[PDB]
Amino acid sequence: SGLKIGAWVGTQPSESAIKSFQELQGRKLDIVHQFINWSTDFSWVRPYADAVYNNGSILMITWEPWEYNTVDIKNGKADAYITRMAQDMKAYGKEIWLRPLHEANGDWYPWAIGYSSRVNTNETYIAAFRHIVDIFRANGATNVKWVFNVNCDNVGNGTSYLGHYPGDNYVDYTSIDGYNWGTTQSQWQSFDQVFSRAYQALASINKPIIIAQFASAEIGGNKARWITEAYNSIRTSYNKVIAAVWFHENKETDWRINSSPEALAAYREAIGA
Numbered sequence: 001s002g003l004k005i006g007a008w009v010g011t012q013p014s015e016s017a018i019k020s021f022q023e024l025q026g027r028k029l030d031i032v033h034q035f036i037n038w039s040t041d042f043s044w045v046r047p048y049a050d051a052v053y054n055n056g057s058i059l060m061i062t063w064e065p066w067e068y069n070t071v072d073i074k075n076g077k078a079d080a081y082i083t084r085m086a087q088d089m090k091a092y093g094k095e096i097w098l099r100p101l102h103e104a105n106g107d108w109y110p111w112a113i114g115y116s117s118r119v120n121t122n123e124t125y126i127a128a129f130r131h132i133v134d135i136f137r138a139n140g141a142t143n144v145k146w147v148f149n150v151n152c153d154n155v156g157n158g159t160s161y162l163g164h165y166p167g168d169n170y171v172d173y174t175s176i177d178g179y180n181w182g183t184t185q186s187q188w189q190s191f192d193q194v195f196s197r198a199y200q201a202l203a204s205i206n207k208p209i210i211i212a213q214f215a216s217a218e219i220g221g222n223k224a225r226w227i228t229e230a231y232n233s234i235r236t237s238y239n240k241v242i243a244a245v246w247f248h249e250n251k252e253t254d255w256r257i258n259s260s261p262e263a264l265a266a267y268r269e270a271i272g273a
């Protein structure tokens with residue numbers, strides 16, 4: 001019942017990318033995270049899934065519908081694609097944590113409630129999420145566990161932590177994403193400062209919580225101490241969190257655990273045995 005350690009490793013998780021990250025952090029990955037879109041069939045996923053299961057890890061897939069908005073989805077216009085994914089995931093048989101339409105309380109994704117076209121509402125979101133789950137259950141894909149998500153902050157008009165919550169009957173895990181951006185954009189914020197408000201909201205739901213994406217910048221503060229403090233906070237005060245999934249990518253800023261030697265040493269120590 002210890003905290004599970006996961007990561008998006010900055011590239012799709014081939015066998016070598018998983019093993020390299022495990023060498024890097026000095027520990028097994030309990031969870032391996034990958035991002036795919038809604039024009040990707042399971043056969044493209046399968047070699048990555050095999051690598052993850054062969055390593056003895058849980059695959060978490062963030063499933064991003066760039067190709068269909070919530071109205072599209074709830075009206076059934078993607079159902080052939082959803083049905084094929086469900087059938088293929090059932091046939092695969094292994095436990096997959098699937099996180100569709102994430103960060104919908106932001107404004108950066110075309111399925112999010114804050115997205116500037118105004119097309120996605122609480123109602124269309126909930127109906128879309130429920131429709132996906134319904135199709136998977138009709139196809140016997142009970143191995144697929146459903147992850148609800150919020151961004152740490154509500155960004156854009158109409159956004160909230162729970163307005164778009166599809167209900168306990170459709171969710172196995174909840175989750176929060178968030179970053180300490182430092183001065184890269186923004187101000188330096190502790191893990192608590194980033195995550196406390198969203199956690200308070202999700203703690204009202206009797207589902208375990210995953211920190212599905214998090215990381216810190218180097219600039220504007222001490223990233224090594226931030227990492228030490230983040231994991232201590234998770235263990236001390238975020239008792240409903242069961243997993244911490246770092247976002248290891250040199251992208252908007254260097255989120256990587258090895259953005260500096262000091263950060264790497266702190267991460268290796270913080271994740272524990």
Ligand SMILES: Cc1cc(=O)oc2cc(O[C@@H]3O[C@H](CO)[C@@H](O)[C@H](O[C@@H]4O[C@H](CO)[C@@H](O)[C@H](O)[C@H]4O)[C@H]3O)ccc12
Nearest residue numbers: 008035064103106108151152153155179213249251252
């Ligand atoms: C303006 C704002 C405010 C905030 O609180 O949070 C975010 C998050 C955000 O995008 C998400 O977080 C990171 C950091 O910006 C993005 O990199 C990430 O994009 C996803 O990255 C993966 C891996 O590179 C891709 O495969 C996915 O396709 C992509 O969606 C977002 O989750 C933006 C703005 C923002």
